[model samples]
Target: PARSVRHIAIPAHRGLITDRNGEPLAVSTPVTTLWANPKELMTAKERWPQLAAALGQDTKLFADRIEQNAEREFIYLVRGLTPEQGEGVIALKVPGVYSIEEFRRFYPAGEVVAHAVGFTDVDDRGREGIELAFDEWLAGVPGKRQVLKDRRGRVIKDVQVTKNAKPGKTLALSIDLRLQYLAHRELRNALLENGAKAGSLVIMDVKTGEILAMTNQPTYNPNNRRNLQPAAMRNRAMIDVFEPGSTVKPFSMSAALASGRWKPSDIVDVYPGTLQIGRYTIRDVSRNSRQLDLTGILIKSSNVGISKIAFDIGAESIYSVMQQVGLGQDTGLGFPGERVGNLPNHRKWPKAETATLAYGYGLSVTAIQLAHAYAALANDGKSVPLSMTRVDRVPDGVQVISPEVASTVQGMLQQVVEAQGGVFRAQVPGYHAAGKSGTARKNAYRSLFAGFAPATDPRIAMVVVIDEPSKAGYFGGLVSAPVFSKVMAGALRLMNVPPDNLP
Candidate 1:
């Protein structure tokens, strides 16, 4: 007796991802891919040479692909080939060679958005960046199938369709391609010009928490995956953490003011460059031993001054404020291998650690985290969660400091950018700019500058971090300041922000 069976076929749906302006960031391109079964090929050894020549592979490399498992399964010879190329291979008509239609992910802007858009595997699975975070949404349902065969191995009548596949909805990121390119170019130039190991730059809208541009150098090309190093492949803005140095002082002062511990006008006598705190002595980076006001403490970036202020407020208050500013908390930006950074628990704080923490020592933070904290100062003392994806509604911010204290901090930051002795060069010809410059000597030493411009009505806030600059001057002011200037200048122009008090 003979039995009959039916076969059903279903199609899979692919989704699209776009940028804030509805421009495609990640899209699937339809193309034919080639696969083969070595067992069925006639003159398998002889044909290997021809196949290897056409595919531009060495004989050994080509043979390795087919030689792996000669019997049961099919192996991919090539993927993402053009129609002509696919046809050229198919024309050879080698036995057991098969072709399958698939979608390949392509980034039109390439490395400009590498860290945010991410890449996928050959199977179309999301691996990192936004792809990993919203994997379910980006990956549509693959269709299921059931097949049946007749006793004689002849195909019987089959069902044309099974379960229908649903395409994934498109995700819109908050990044601007133009701004991203600008930031990338600026940071790349900074690394080259300053002779630094690598660097990262971030630009965000102060009020919305929308990341306009986030770029890092020593950035790797996602299209080419071979020979990638841990450092080149890293998304430093999100993953790397370091002591932020004086850049953290403004926040420390904000905490003191918010807690009713200090006033902007209050003067702290920083008579000596170094002060004895228990067994350790805390010192200012600058050797001058002059009295500094709360504002002056930040402009001058005096470690001793901030440490004294932190001592007055106590570690618990300072740590509480740091927590409020998003330190030690993940930004939830959906990048792979993100670090939450290090901030000592309030209850476990030691006297020396407390003093160091005030001036960005003993604590570690990522560039994005520090940018978020600076955004609070730029946004009237309210701290909001940072985001890489687009949001329909404005993010509600947590109040980190009173408006009065925030205002004072903003005024002080403005002077930092405006003063010649302060860090950051290449100021916009006419914009009222403000920011802080910080240099930390850890294992290899690093430099950072986190601040905002158009101080009166802040529009954008940014952070620049340089790793292990080997030049004669490795200070944040010397190494990272110029990057801030270049990135901010381009970002401001891209946003069509009119010059402030243009000369």
Candidate 2:
């Protein structure tokens, strides 16, 4: 049967993507991509060597790709080449070689927002990160033109088409480009300065649950694809999960208070620096436990003290609190390959697990999840869903704990920053600040710091995780705390958040 052919033309417009501040994150720019028809090329195999040289590849490799995929009607020879490079290949005038005009995804901020905004592949398909999440919106249907060809294969005329391609819709993200860059810069600097293996940092607006900044160290530029390491490519803030260490204290403490089992002023004898639970012993890194109250436990970050509280509060209660705060759930923030983090079901939690979990051991969580949990505390027990897109209306929050409990925890967290020798050092000159510093040992050698600030009427909260800092005090206080101070100070000022208490 002969195939009936008709000439038609279709048009489409690419979708626009903007940042939270309404600045362009990804935009379509006019570009050209080179492709080849394998059948046409096979007919001119004798000229393969010359053509391959023009394309800057070994003749055999180029010929093999075409020959392997010969049955396919169309194939791309190369992608992401500059206009001049495409022209160079076209100038060869090879029979099968041709260039087509198309829009290429460009990230003006480069590696700063690359992980969050993500990038597209040669076929314009979203492969990872937000690119995959919102692919339907950002990907536009390419316009097509159909024309009649004579027996000699010369185009005669174009045919009018009734169906037109609908342009893709735009996506507005919750990311702030400037803050994203700051996070990237600060995390990178922390890794370099401390000689750490890798690191991640996330800044969120406590009130709205919007991720203002998220960055992972050892990141690569999307524009430049060469020499990228697997670790460098990971979006650790969202994709990697690690035991949160002492950073998990606040959640358990809140649970105790909410259940009326303990009060902020209730004193628990910490028995100096170490306490034994089961066969394992929990000890404070600072080695000064003393008889401490809830505020003292947090300000000193006493692991033994927290473990005792967890033992009394029990694992079931703590796990229930964590689940309510979104620990066992995904936030659906539109990042590709996000880890839900590991939290054992309450039924499976062991006696030792309670003590271990209290001090940020035995359990793993993504940086974003930890920040979201803290945001619940900062927002007076309201657990708002984290968002990556621009949200016009404030999301209804789930109550994770009583407002009194959350407020108590917030006050303790604030003292962690305001008190001298506490983790954070970057205190605003004229404002009250509060936060906690965490450094936990990874499977091999890694560490993390998750903290938040401006304790009263909180605005911004953040976490910094550094992997394998040099032996010189790799603890969160010494390494990630200072980094937190620097980034948070700038972020606070950028948002024009007034100091909690003027100096």
* Per-structure clash totals for the candidates: 0, 4
Residue 154 C-alpha lDDT in model 2: 31
lDDT of 1 by residue, 6-115 (tens): 44434354567787888887887776877776655533577777777877889887787666656533567787675567788778776566676777777777788888
Per-residue lDDT for 84-160 in model 2, tens only? 67887788788867786666777778888878877878666777677788888776665566666443233457665
lDDT of 1 at 281: 88
Clashing pairs in 2: 129-336, 245-360, 414-434, 446-468
Displacement of residue 101 (Cα, Å) in model 1 is: 1.3
Whole-model lDDT values for every prediction: 0.78, 0.76
Lowest lDDT 10-residue stretch of candidate 2: 1-10
Worst 10 residues of 1 by lDDT: 152-161
